[PDB]
Symmetry: C2
Subunit: 464 residues, 2 copies
């Protein structure tokens, strides 16, 4: 990885476009004004992996110089500016980044982090690293979207059961194959794990362990589970044998068995319902059988599966008046699940007097891939410049779109007397009318000055 | 350091225990299940080199995965013995064979694009282990396909409104670096876009192509100097003309793009470009035009209003089709809210107002590289053939409530009839196959260069 090749191409030419004698470029990141509050998570990953330490070398400067020489068909690369950083700071970026603590749940339209150069010669470096810093939109959005789904599950699980036991395992990450890269997989799985503990994207475990860390042995957990290939390999006529072999191999731990390979309704009624009914009613509450449909209308299929199970297994009525499966039998819906359909499924189950205790969800591309930067309007903008000894509050204000107006001047975030958050502009945070700035210095001159445990992030992001 | 033993879906760790007894072979294939009627196959070679080839198993990686999976599952289900066998017998090289259509080939939906099988019976479980890594080829396939479909739309409207295809390969510029989910994705997606175009600002794509594919040209993608809002707004609200004048003077001999909507895009075009700084614009050469960049409001309406204003301040001609053409020193680029849908609406609306497509170029970010899913082309990886207890079985899924989820049966091959249509032969009936062995037992057996891939992915 070469930081001098990790920016938008036109930013190579911007050091020649700022007003002369600009000694400071000061920029900020916000989720511009469902999705009223965002989970701020992912910046520390970028700092540790990409920005800290000696990130400029003679080899990297040469690589970038030759690349841009042919890319622009011209010499525009700021070779002397990058050489200065290598010579004066031993390849350490003279940058200061102040950010809200990761895991903080902040309403839209607030400053989340600020970036400024610490050396007047490096005024151009602030927005050079905009591109790599803006990519924090993705873990912010995954964590925010995951948390909004936790709100949905928490609300309906309480109304149908009276407690939240197992809430952290109600939404399981199945997104490894559906994202665009290995790195994206690890980032997005880790953002999901801010709110839940169930994941099949192993890349998230390794990313957390390396760039955040946890006191717990692992940040995510999973259970043995079948896919279609391991069932259909027994032959169409031996689906019963595949089910029996797998539940036997995993009788001391929860196991999930996909049941829609040929006929999902025949699987729940005949195979699980009668042929292999004895091995279902015999496993522990801690190691139940989990039935997984993977086709048809998500809400219609789970309701039709639950009702078939209600005819072959003892279903009771809990304290809230909702039907509850036996403790040795669960259902996971892991197909076509996003924030929209999840709401539809649990609301439909409640209308059918089915308790949310019976159901868990898996989400793949809907959790980690079908998300964009314009969902929360994640944006990075310059709000303050110092040119020839004068600090100037700068901003954009497009006439055809007042929603894209950006903030002015030096920014700070404050806890209000009512317990909420407000962003002050034009340096008014210096007066500390609402107490101290909440932005902490997390990166300064190539060092990560403030870091957070994943345990601290999970605590900051909890519900209620 | 990357550890392929930690690069799979968690439940696949426990699958070696779920197969029928005496299973010796698992054979799987990738397809874009059955408007994107044809797909560009691209990106597998990157995956092969970066993650699958060479010594990918070590004693340390086995121990790391063992420790992780013990806590992850709260149980010992990691196939440490199977992975040790790979380390000892093949020096940590994967005993798998991969056959694939050549990269850049344009293949209709519902055909086999590559197949995976184990070459060692002890490693029956390994085929679906690396499914997770191989399935992510959906992304470069989908980017390259969607980018090519936009190139069809651009080529068709450029030919109607101008009679030629000059500059086509620079009409859709990659702006997606900040709008993608990771640095690796930016590299993969930008390289896939460069299969069809040559204009890009996502630099990571250049590095990927030179490392894993290679080109005879000095570089696979090109860009030009351009301003952002911070380089304009830093001059002060009252000094937008000074910012403009400084920037076009610093880049007076190359094309330069100046975003002109910081405060009022229509005032910038009529007053600042069309009057105050007009003398700096009418002097520029054809090879170094000013490119005016709107960035807000409705994409098609803002474009039409900018062209109208510029049409009154600068001499407009009529091309050899009856469509208006700005002077060669002035151009427009729309780089906001552009995807394949809004791109179509913009070129349609410009044709309606008799504006040539020569006047416009497009920049696409999230729309080109992020707003895409595995569902777009229904990219799917399924097991179609197993051998258990010495008996070969053609296997497939067929959910009753979704016939479109049906998969193919048995050993597969991809053939072309003498007429030209493509057919995937199932059940081993292929016994000329277009699938060539590209990976076998840890080595890349066949490679393609980016020039070859671009040649295969050309339009008709
Ligand atoms: N641990 C798992 N258990 C069952 N299915 C899985 C698992 N991991 C991935 N998948 C599959 O991968 C698909 C990805 O979802 P999506 O990205 O929404 O298409 C799911 O719908 C499942 O079929
Ligand atoms: N080379 C570039 N020239 C102009 N704008 C760019 C460039 N690269 C990225 N952008 C920004 O990225 C936006 C498009 O990406 P997106 O918002 O993801 O569609 C543009 O409107 C600009 O704000
Ligand atoms: Mg934009």
């Amino acid at each position: 990885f070469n930081i001098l090749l990790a920016t938008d191409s036109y930013k190579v030419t911007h050091y020649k476009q700022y007003p002369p004698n600009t000694s400071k470029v000061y920029s900020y990141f916000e989720c511009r004004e469902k999705y009223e509050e965002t989970v701020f998570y992912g910046l520390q990953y970028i700092l540790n992996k990409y920005l800290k330490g000696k990130v400029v070398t003679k080899e990297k400067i040469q690589e970038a110089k030759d690349v841009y020489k042919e890319h622009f068909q011209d010499d525009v690369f700021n070779e002397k500016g990058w050489n200065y950083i290598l010579e004066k700071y031993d390849g350490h970026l003279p940058i200061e980044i102040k950010a809200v603590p990761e895991g903080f749940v902040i309403p839209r339209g607030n400053v989340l982090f600020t970036v400024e150069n610490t050396d007047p010669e490096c005024y151009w470096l602030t927005n050079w690293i905009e591109t790599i810093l803006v990519q924090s939109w993705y873990p912010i959005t995954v964590a925010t979207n995951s948390r909004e789904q936790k709100k949905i599950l928490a609300k309906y699980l309480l109304e149908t059961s009276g407690n939240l036991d197992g809430l952290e395992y109600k939404l399981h990450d199945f997104g490894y194959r559906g994202v665009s890269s290995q790195e994206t997989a690890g980032i997005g799985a880790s953002a999901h794990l801010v709110n839940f503990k169930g994941t099949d994207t192993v890349a998230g475990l390794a990313l957390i362990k390396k760039y955040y860390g946890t006191k717990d042995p692992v940040p995510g957990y999973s259970v043995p589970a079948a896919e279609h290939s391991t069932i259909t390999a027994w032959g169409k006529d031996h689906e019963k044998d595949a089910f029996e072999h797998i539940v036997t191999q995993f009788s001391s731990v929860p196991v999930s068995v996909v049941s829609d390979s040929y006929d999902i309704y025949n699987a729940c009624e005949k195979i699980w319902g009668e042929d292999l009914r004895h091995l279902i009613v015999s496993r522990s509450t801690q190691a139940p059988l989990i039935i997984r449909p993977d086709s048809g209308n998500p809400l219609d299929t789970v309701l039709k599966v639950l009702e078939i199970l209600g005819k072959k297994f003892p279903v009771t009525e809990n304290s809230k008046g909702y039907k509850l499966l036996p403790p040795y039998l669960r259902v996971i819906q892991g197909d076509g699940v996003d924030i929209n359909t999840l709401q539809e499924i649990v609301e439909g189950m409640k209308q059918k007097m089915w308790s949310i205790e019976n159901i868990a969800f898996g989400s793949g591309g809907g959790l980690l891939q079908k998300l964009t930067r314009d969902l929360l309007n994640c944006s990075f903008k310059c709000s303050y410049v110092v040119t020839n000894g004068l600090g100037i509050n700068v901003f954009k204000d497009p006439v055809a779109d007042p929603n894209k107006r950006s903030k002015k001047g030096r920014l700070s975030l404050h806890r209000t007397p009512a317990g909420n958050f407000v962003t002050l502009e034009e340096g008014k945070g210096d007066l500390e009318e609402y107490g101290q700035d909440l932005l902490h210095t997390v990166f300064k001159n190539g060092k990560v000055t403030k870091s957070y445990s994943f345990d601290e992030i999970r605590k900051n992001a909890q519900l209620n």
